[PDB]
């Protein structure tokens, strides 16, 4: 439809660049835009065996239909030096954050409805001395977002997570009026505005085991996250909880719920991930741009070998279309 | 070589009494004998209209034989007052204890088997004025065990936890060395002698989410947990990790091991409970005795209703008999 899509392979000696190619053995609902180096995917895909169609893009006019089961579109991107999978090079650094921009200010300019994105290494941008927090950070400067929301996704299950990428033991601290309070907000806002949500019921869960038991095992419970939730009701946001996780995360209680919002990333990526068989979307919420990602890594051990799982990147398209469809 | 197990129906304002009342339309393959107050039992049954002969046991002679389909062996513990389903009394807290001292004398003593306990409610025992901290820590003081391990299990799925009960704030504190050695131990020691695998293979989770990434994101798994678990591989303990929880807890890995060990509460016990709510049976490894033990609550509110599964409970029973047979 008159909706493309743009597709970021990431790290190009990852993985990435191999998910991309595999699923372009189907033929995309949408036009999906690959923006990547030709080179780096013709290798790859001859490194795969497979054989896929590389067809070139430009800005001048994008394209309006998918590309046949084994074409992929491709809005060319110089890489600086040659690659060699599962072999890290500081020097294509500035490559990735380039398609990396490429696609958000794409997004932001309507040329696209939204972005998938596929694995970036962290460790070789810091190395190229090239600032980079992360992955999400970097996207959310480049929109001018303040603050986003991390939601983890499978089919028929939604995870956000009030807190992402900490040290267990900082944690409890971690969880604040504050931060429920602009988590709660932006996770409602977005299943209401990319998800098309009227009214999202979102399940909520204690930090402690047993939600704090009445007070007996931790107090976080009473003093902090129920008077929170409170307030919040009170201004519209279906918010049930604080609810023990292991009383939650069962066929029962998810059956009328809209989202989980987990307390920790333990504490709701494992059902996640059991459930899905490994394959999880991550979705960037509080962007002014609709942008999923996979859960994973890299994997630069496994580059070019073809022994890969698509099914995170698979359900990264879906989601990405999905929520075009209800409305970027 | 005749096998008896002790069995308490615990909070008697409880659904307690119900599941054992329900079980013993069943013939067991052992006897099974109910230490609690036969009159609560005639009542309760009266209550849910079942038709159960209640067949006192004296401490004089043990039951050889299991009782008939729809009977039910009591070794009546006397109440200190009435009993209303559904209402809590402090003057009844004595009487859960003495029913649970009595079991778990009992097999100190060498009369049982095992023991297999049904919901207690821990707030009205500490509201009439004595220390519990619980089930499993009851019966690790009564039988002088410094450290014990709690594990969950359903069909397919067994996991064992470092720390249970304990405010989020606490747990990275607590994974010590000398802690996670002994869990490991305990863990390795009754999945062979309780549970008849030979070589027992077991995944265990690292603390922080990724474990600890490289140590990017907390130090615990690098200075204490890689450490302890390297020195019992090297012993023949056949212990995988740690590794992330959310990779662990994946089908892939889930079908190749004996169980799982995870740090604390609520990164093990979701995937189980999603699993297998229903049918999981808590097991209290590490105690000189064989213990059971659903892991619902008392469900005050459905005491008498009928209204309940017993499905856990009749999972807790089989688990028990096995781990006797198998041998304590
Ligand atoms: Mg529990
Ligand atoms: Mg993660």
Redesign the pocket.
């Known amino acids: 439809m008159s909706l493309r899509f743009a597709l970021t392979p990431g790290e190009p000696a990852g993985i990435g660049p191999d998910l991309c190619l595999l699923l372009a053995r189907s033929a995309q609902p949408h036009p999906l835009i690959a923006i990547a180096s030709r080179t780096l995917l013709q290798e790859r895909a001859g490194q795969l065996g497979l054989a896929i169609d590389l067809k070139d893009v430009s800005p001048a006019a994008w394209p309006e239909r998918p590309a046949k089961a084994g074409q992929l579109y491709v809005w060319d991107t110089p890489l600086a030096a040659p690659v060699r999978p599962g072999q890290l090079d500081r020097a294509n650094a500035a490559y990735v954050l380039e398609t990396l921009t490429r696609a958000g200010q794409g997004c932001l300019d309507g040329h696209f409805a939204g972005m998938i994105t596929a694995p970036v290494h962290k460790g070789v941008i810091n190395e190229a001395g090239i600032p980079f927090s992360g992955h999400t950070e970097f996207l959310a400067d480049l929109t001018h977002t303040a603050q986003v929301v991390m939601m983890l996704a499978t089919r028929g299950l939604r995870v956000a997570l009030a807190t992402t990428?900490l040290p267990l033991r900082e944690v409890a601290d971690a969880i604040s009026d504050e931060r429920l309070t602009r988590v709660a907000r932006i996770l409602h806002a977005d299943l209401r505005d990319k998800f098309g949500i009227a009214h999202p019921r979102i399940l909520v869960c204690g930090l402690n085991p047993h939600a704090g038991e009445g007070g007996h095992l931790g107090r976080e419970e009473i003093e902090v996250i129920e008077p929170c939730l409170e307030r919040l009701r009170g201004e519209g946001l279906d918010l049930i909880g604080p609810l023990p996780a292991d009383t939650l995360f069962t066929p029962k209680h998810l059956e009328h719920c809209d989202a989980v919002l987990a307390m920790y990333?333990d504490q709701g990526?494992p059902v996640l991930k059991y459930k899905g068989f490994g394959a999880a979307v991550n979705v960037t919420l509080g962007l002014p741009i609709i942008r999923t990602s996979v859960?994973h890594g890299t994997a630069l051990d496994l580059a070019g070998s073809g022994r890969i799982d698509s099914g995170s990147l698979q359900v990264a398209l879906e989601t990405a279309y999905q929520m075009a469809a209800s409305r970027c």
């Open positions: 990428h990333h990526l859960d």
